[PDB]
A paper describes a structure:
We chose pH 8.0 to ensure strict alkaline conditions for our structural studies and note that the GluA2–TARPγ2 kinetics at pH 8.0 matched that at pH 7.4, used in the functional studies above. At pH 8.0, the BD chains were spaced apart by ~55 Å (center of mass (COM) distance) throughout the classes, while the BD distances ranged widely at pH 5.5; some NTD dimers adopted an upright conformation with a ruptured BD interface (class 31), while either one or both dimers bent toward the LBD tier in other classes (classes 19, 23 and 37), resulting in a range of COM distances between the BD chains (70–93 Å). The two-fold symmetric BD NTD interface is stapled together by cation–π interactions between R172 and F231 on either end that are unique to GluA2 and is stabilized in its center by van der Waals contacts and H-bonds, including those between the H208 side chain and the I203 main chain. Despite its relatively small size (400 Å solvent-accessible surface area), this GluA2-specific NTD interface largely maintains a compact conformation of the receptor in structural snapshots of the gating cycle.
AMPA glutamate receptors (AMPARs) are ion channel tetramers that mediate the majority of fast excitatory synaptic transmission. They are composed of four subunits (GluA1–GluA4); the GluA2 subunit dominates AMPAR function throughout the forebrain.
Residue numbers in the entry:
A (entry chain C), B (entry chain D), C (entry chain B), D (entry chain A): 10 to 383
Write the structure that this text describes.
């Protein structure tokens, strides 16, 4: 009744760690407690990721929570699938079916295509970033080929910031050659903030221009900066701030202090932090299910090292995976239900549009049902 | 005075190993000799790749030669950068800059864009495969954005060996429906062979079609099947069989036997194995230059541990990298010279066409000079 | 009882011999058994054919089964007519009336002419091989002279196999220069396979061309390579694979231990082998009927030599011939009925084309009724 | 000393036999006198032909002379090739190379094609019979395909004489309405005589009709019937009546009597008879050369039975073949010389076109040069 888990967090991650500890203290069952081993590192460094994973495996950790990017996803997936260690992450889902990886970030390709069809778009620009994967870009290109679209895929992830002014000015001047008024911003948070800021400077945020933020976090950024101007702005939001549970959680979250809980005294929580909260919840739920199933998973610092030749797995790993992937709970992100691969199934995505008054949801998207209008 | 190096090879790259051994015996001794440690492994498995790298590092190898895949390149780059151990490879160049990696494959984006400009194409399909990366697809996407092209990018990678015929057939009927005669194949040898077989079966290799084989191995595939069809078949070739060095090497190499040297009894040699030969030459020349400079590189003791904390790299790694990047030799691929990032500069790619009498070179593409017609 | 027969199988006809053995072991009963003398020989050698015929006559056989070509048909027919010994064959029917020769192959000239009239052709080519024969070419030339057609007869039997690629390529180039779109392939299985391979290689199987495989073995050749090209490919088939008897035959034929029965472990049976099986059936039926007629068919070793001077035949062979020509049974080729001259009558030939979903029987041809469309 | 030879003659070749005996008595030398054993049989009967051949072979005969038909050429050539026995014939050349056979009849396809080219023919009818093979038919069809001729080939051998009136009228009316004014008669002497008799009866010999008789016996048939008909008639001839040797032979032939020399009391002889005479001459010359070369091909005992398994070859037969294939003597049919295969070369064919004063040689044809006009 003393489960030791592992935690990998980026060097500079505060809100996600705060949500992690909030969930841990919220779901601290009197039957058992989860003791985490938190490692802060540069996730982009595959060597550092491997070092942390190997140290946690040597320490005897049953389940590992962490993050990965395009430069550190393959190593994590391979190590987990070989050593039979369950990995729970809020990061982007891997392209394919990688075992022993629990992916709680819902896919956005289907919702993005459904929203594009709803908006009746034929020609548009697609500004993407290579720091998260090109699966969305490939899906957009395939849909464009199928439905006879004219998509201009432009990468904005390979430019610095000192020459950003001139580079993006040239990019937008080239975009105005075709009179492009509809663009999609499939970029990270800092990248999309740069896009919106430089759009404001260049003066292309006037009416007629349509912008789509291709991420689950729409209300986290400076929506007020481009709120005025009359330009269409649309996006997605996994979290429903109007839900009773979300409001109850956010009240306590705002009442928490900032010293011991960095990035907490605010009325907006990042979707990564929300997914970390549901990750804590699902970990506790799976371990309660394992305890109630009367299954012995006794393990300690005796499994061995990381680079054992041959690397023999342990039989409890497949049972831990079955327990993790066979739960159905509800959190900030909504209904949670994974498949045999480790991806959510019956999730719901709330679509919001930005107006002068403020952000406002226009409908919801699901798997069985396409975009719905209220 | 023996120098120990490492070797990573995929399970199936027999011709590459044969070319490695041929280069080893050719450049056997001038003032010393090399001692490679070969470790055949699944190159796409990041865990196995890490295990091989760590075993070779513990063995105390001065340099490492091996391949990598799109899902195993980050591990090599990170480990080599953090351990100051060079990695000479004939695989696809990395998307960016990475120290301690000596990439031997010349870039193809510039030559492909120059060939498209020379052919004056406005609506060309792009059948890409997710093995060597999507960097060329991205580059052609920005080029299309900046040159007003109609690119129909289609992924032909995520298909199994059970509906290949149906998938390729339906793809080509779709291409006929939008009436698209210009197609670019950015796939490897086996994939382009499958595509060529399918297009022959459906009967679209007749006059009125144009295909570009976007790989350095234009003649490595079986072009005799589409030689008499009547459609343009362009491509790029890195080895010139009419060159003195290549002709002498082929005369020495075709007389061998397929028992001790698998895949070494043919008049043609794959560009990957050619780059293996030139990589053996480059390593030999670099170590010869190091010996001539009288720099002490021998270890003072054991190499250490792969996952040691902190990862301390030896002071001779920078010297090894500089010596490897400072060599300028002539090989099968042509002039060999590396810049500060480990890429290849001052190279030449011969553009060739498949006429009814055989593949005939029509010109060459350099970095300082664009496509030249001869 | 024990009745001995002869066998003139060629050197290389493994499937026909396997079908012969299967027919023997299936139609053999306790009433009597058949003892064959199988001699493998170069059937184009009239000397060897005469030697084998003389030896089998010297044994004292009652009927002879085997094959012949255009270079050995006259000697076989003359020997059988002079010696009053019957000869059942699946080879091409003789161009005339010949007694004591039972021919299991139905005529194709009438069906071919009816199909040409149905397709309403005016200017078409006719690729013939002198090795198979020229009776069909003579018939089509006479019809063209009587119906104002433009037939371009081409011989393809004189091409040596050492360089039989440029010959076909130049031939089809000449056909293109003559604007020839419709071609009739009247050749053997190997020759038609080579012609189809060359056609696909030169890209002459696309929509706009028409091909008629003028032989009863439409599906025996590898038709899948040209199925998806898009050009019309018609032909004739004598064996109906959807019939109950044929399906029951294949149910056993596909599981016949190919090592023990060469050319049997397949779902496709050559029309020649099917005719051999039906010939075994008809000879067994004829001998059973002769035994059930209370006729003395006792013959001892009094045959002597085949070149007796004068050559006095044995009168017991005319009853054998009458019984053989008085057989009305069903089989793989369909209804079997022989006229006074031994040529097959009351037969149906299935006319099929090659579609994307496989060959389909669109109708049947008969002597009494012209081509019928379904 | 003497050499036994064999003679195969059809039932009715009385003048052929008379010419053979005239040649024998004229070329009888005191050094050795041959003793031919003449056999009379239906040459179309393959069984009789091979029985006579085997009787000769058992007799111990070194060289065989005789005729063969379309239905016996194959067996004759096969037996001669297998038993290494030389065969000398005046019949049609074999449709292809065949060892141990001497063809004394010069080819006609080249001369006929040259005459057609010189006569500026682009549309005609090729009336042929299947008696001398289809080599000429194949040659004219290939030449028509090459030179864009609209030739209509009609077979007349299969049509029964009783019913060959209504069909004759129908086909001639078809030719008249289609302006098929030019015809070619590649038929035997009797068939062409019947054809010209029918033409005279029907009155289709009006000005414009250009009949070509494709045989060497132009003057053999009745040409005075169409001498004053006003219709062009062109033929070929191998024996020149103006030569001194031919004139002396025809005088010594006409001075003979019809009692002991049937059909020898006229001034008109057949080209086949002339070829028989030249065959006797070449046989005598070859035997004289063999005797002079001090080569004894004498056999101690009987050759045995032809049906012996295995066969019984002998190198003296090969030496005899080499002796025959290296003879260059003149004769009634002109110069005689054989190539390596056995065909006759170094020959000239005299072309005559019928006029009101009778046949007159309008030129000659050879192989070292095209057709020549005098
Ligand atoms: C392959 O087979 C198809 C059969 O579906 C051929 O289609 C044929 O196309 C011709 C076009 O000239 C049709 O002839 C036309 O018939 C109509 C109605 O009788 C008439 O009004 C036109 O003037 C013309 O004569 C023909 O009917 C049609 N076949 C059938 C069965 O309907 C196609 O041509 C074939 N491919 C080749 C290369 O021959
Ligand atoms: C029958 O024999 C007579 C006797 O020569 C032929 O008369 C002449 O034949 C020549 C060719 O042998 C003809 O020359 C041709 O003339 C045409 C123009 O009409 C020209 O285009 C050709 O290139 C060629 O030079 C010639 O006209 C013809 N008549 C005369 C008066 O000289 C005759 O052609 C033969 N055939 C028939 C069916 O009569
Ligand atoms: C921005 O949003 C507005 C309203 O939400 C859109 O306005 C209408 O959109 C419908 C949907 O296709 C069109 O049929 C109408 O013609 C639009 N009317 C007007 C006055 O715009 C608008 O299309 C959206 N996009 C842009 C670029 O403005
Ligand atoms: C295949 O090659 C031929 C000839 O190299 C191309 O034909 C040329 O097409 C261009 C179109 O840009 C015309 O301007 C030229 O006149 C054509 N002929 C020549 C000799 O250049 C053809 O376009 C190529 N592609 C295909 C699909 O056929
Ligand atoms: C032809 O064969 C069929 C099937 O065996 C039979 O029904 C039909 O009566 C036969 N025709 C004649 C004329 O006997």
């Amino acid at each position: 009744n003393s489960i030791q888990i592992g935690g990998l967090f980026p060097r500079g991650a505060d809100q996600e760690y705060s949500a992690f500890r909030v969930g841990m203290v919220q779901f601290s069952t009197s039957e058992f407690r989860l003791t985490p081993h938190i490692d802060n590192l540069e996730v982009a460094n595959s060597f550092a990721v491997t070092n942390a994973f190997c140290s946690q495996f040597s320490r005897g950790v049953y389940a590992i929570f962490g993050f990965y990017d395009k430069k550190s996803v393959n190593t994590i997936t391979s190590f987990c699938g070989t050593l039979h260690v369950s990995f729970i992450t809020p990061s982007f889902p891997t392209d394919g079916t990688h075992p022993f990886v629990i992916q709680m970030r819902p896919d956005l390709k289907g919702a993005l295509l459904s929203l594009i069809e709803y908006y009746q778009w034929d020609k548009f620009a697609y500004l993407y970033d290579s720091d998260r994967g090109l699966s969305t870009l490939q899906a957009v290109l395939d849909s464009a080929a199928e439905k006879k679209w004219q998509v201009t895929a432009i990468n904005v992830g390979n430019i610095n910031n000192d020459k950003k002014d001139e580079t993006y000015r040239s990019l937008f001047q080239d975009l105005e050659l075709k009179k492009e008024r509809r663009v999609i911003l499939d970029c990270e948070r800092d990248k999309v903030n740069d896009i919106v800021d430089q759009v404001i400077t260049i003066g292309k945020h006037v009416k007629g221009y349509h912008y789509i933020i291709a991420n689950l976090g729409f209300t986290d950024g400076d929506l007020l900066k481009i709120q005025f101007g009359g330009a269409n702005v649309s996006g997605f939001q996994i979290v429903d701030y109007d839900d009773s549970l979300v409001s109850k959680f956010i009240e306590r979250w705002s009442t928490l202090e900032e010293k011991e809980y960095p990035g907490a005294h605010t009325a907006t929580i990042k979707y990564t932090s929300a997914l970390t909260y549901d990750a804590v919840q699902v970990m506790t739920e799976a371990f309660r299910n394992l305890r109630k199933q009367r299954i012995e998973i006794s393990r300690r610092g005796n499994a061995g090292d990381c680079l054992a030749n041959p690397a023999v797995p342990w039989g409890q790993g497949v049972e831990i995976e079955r327990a993790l992937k066979q739960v159905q709970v509800e959190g900030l992100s909504g209904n949670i239900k994974f498949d045999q691969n480790g991806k959510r199934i019956n999730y719901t995505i709330n679509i919001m549009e930005l107006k002068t008054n403020g952000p406002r949801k226009i409908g919801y998207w699901s798997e069985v049902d396409k975009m719905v209008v209220t």
